[PDB]
């Protein structure tokens, strides 16, 4: 049977970039035609294999990451790069082999007054690895304060809320990110392209 | 750009007050600017009341929040205002204006319109 | 929730600088707006984004921020000015809030 590329891509709410979602795909026969033949997508580049050699290759697990960050921040999903996403919520491998997809969701992550469900990791301490996910609420310290969970002096919150609302530029819209990564492990071939 | 208001000048206590703002120099069903009422009493500081955007969702003041409720017309190129249960505090110069939101923080009432008194009193 | 503070009353003698300033903690996460009103006149915006002028504002309106307070500042205060003047900004939980004014004197 297929691929249930659906059930990402087409998913109803998608999770903040701080904890962003990690589907495996493993023992079917996925089609990458529908994917580059869709004309909702503002940003498609892929890293390493072409869009259309996708269809005659044969990965072992297929990896669908998907998250919402905002416009300006599309161009830090990328092999490479810095920024508060790029260093703190999802880094991307140097060597990086696969095609990153996004699209303009305003229509659907954005609410009058503010859609404040999708946030962002804005502190830590050392960079995250490659596909790092750092789920912890911990009150960050810098330096050497008391304050016992009161957001205080030197004891802030580390997440941060987008608040998507309508009548944004398009740089602070919210853009849904489907992450595809193809590991060609050396294993059984489960996942063919057709 | 121009905005209008509409509706009774005078609202006994207790009751609801009903207002429609019509603009006539764009367009309502704009994806990029919210349609508020802010009010005034008599010599009085301003206060926000409600803003409102062309599909439905709107959000208004917590103090004025359960007897308020804002609707639109992208038909008619018009957006109202109904206050419930009207005391006489609420005697005041009602205003529409034209709201933008460009950044997270960024909001300001760029044109405002003339405004109409209504002055709640049996 | 949050409170924007000005004070009610600002003289100037005609020809010197009036400052207005507004403050609150709303204004951590927030810009200032500054809005002029005439006796039985709708208000008119005067500042964008805390400091910047529209196209019907002369040069001789300014604004600056510091900390949890923005200032306008009118070089060269004429007559043409005195009125009440309103700063408003719009927190994190979408309260979009007003200041209490300021009246504007030119002391004749």
């Known amino acids: 049977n297929l691929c249930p590329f659906g059930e990402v891509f087409n998913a109803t709410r998608f999770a903040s970039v701080y904890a962003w979602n990690r589907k495996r795909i493993s023992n079917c026969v996925a089609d990458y035609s529908v994917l580059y033949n869709s004309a909702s997508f503002s940003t498609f580049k892929c890293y390493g294999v072409s869009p259309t050699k996708l269809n005659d290759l044969c990965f072992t697990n297929v990896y669908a990451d998907s998250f919402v960050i905002r416009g300006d921040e599309v161009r830090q999903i990328a092999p490479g790069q810095t920024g508060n996403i790029a260093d703190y919520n999802y880094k991307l491998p140097d060597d990086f082999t696969g095609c990153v997809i996004a699209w303009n969701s305003n229509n659907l992550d954005s609410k009058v007054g503010g859609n404040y469900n999708y946030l962002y990791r804005l502190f830590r301490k050392s960079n995250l690895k490659p596909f790092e996910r750092d789920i912890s609420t911990e009150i960050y310290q810098a330096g050497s304060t008391p304050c016992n969970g009161v957001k205080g002096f030197n004891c802030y919150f580390p997440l941060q809320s987008y608040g998507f609302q309508p009548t944004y530029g398009v740089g602070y819209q919210p853009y849904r990110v489907v992450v595809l990564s193809f590991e060609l492990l050396h294993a059984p071939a489960t996942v063919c392209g057709k | 750009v121009q905005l209008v208001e509409s509706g009774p000048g005078q609202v006994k206590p207790s009751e609801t007050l009903s207002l429609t703002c019509t603009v006539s120099?764009?367009?309502?069903?704009?994806?990029?600017?919210?349609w508020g009422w802010i009010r005034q009493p008599p010599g009085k500081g301003l206060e926000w009341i409600g803003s409102?955007?062309?599909?439905?969702?709107?959000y208004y003041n917590p103090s004025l929040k359960s007897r308020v409720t804002i609707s639109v017309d992208t038909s008619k190129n018009q957006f109202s205002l109904k206050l419930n249960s009207v005391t006489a505090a609420d005697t005041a110069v009602f205003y529409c204006?034209?709201?933008?939101?460009?950044?997270?923080?960024?909001?300001?009432?760029?044109?405002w319109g003339q405004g109409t008194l209504v002055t709640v009193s049996s | 929730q949050s409170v924007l503070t000005q004070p009610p009353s600002v003289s100037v003698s005609p020809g010197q600088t009036a400052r207005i300033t507004c403050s609150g903690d709303?204004?951590?996460?927030?810009?200032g707006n500054w809005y002029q009103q005439k006796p039985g006149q709708a208000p008119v915006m005067v500042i964008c984004?805390?400091?910047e002028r529209p196209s019907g504002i002369p040069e001789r309106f300014s604004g600056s921020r510091s900390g949890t307070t923005v200032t306008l500042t009118i070089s060269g205060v004429q007559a043409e000015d005195e009125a009440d003047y309103h700063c408003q900004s719009a927190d994190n939980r979408a309260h979009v809030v007003f200041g209490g004014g300021t009246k504007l004197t030119v002391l004749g």
């Open positions: 120099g764009g367009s309502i069903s704009s994806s990029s600017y919210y």
């Open positions: 709303a204004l951590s996460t927030q810009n």
């Open positions: 984004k805390d400091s």
């Open positions: 409102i955007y062309y599909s439905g969702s709107a």
């Open positions: 204006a034209r709201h933008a939101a460009p950044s997270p923080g960024d909001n300001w009432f760029d044109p």
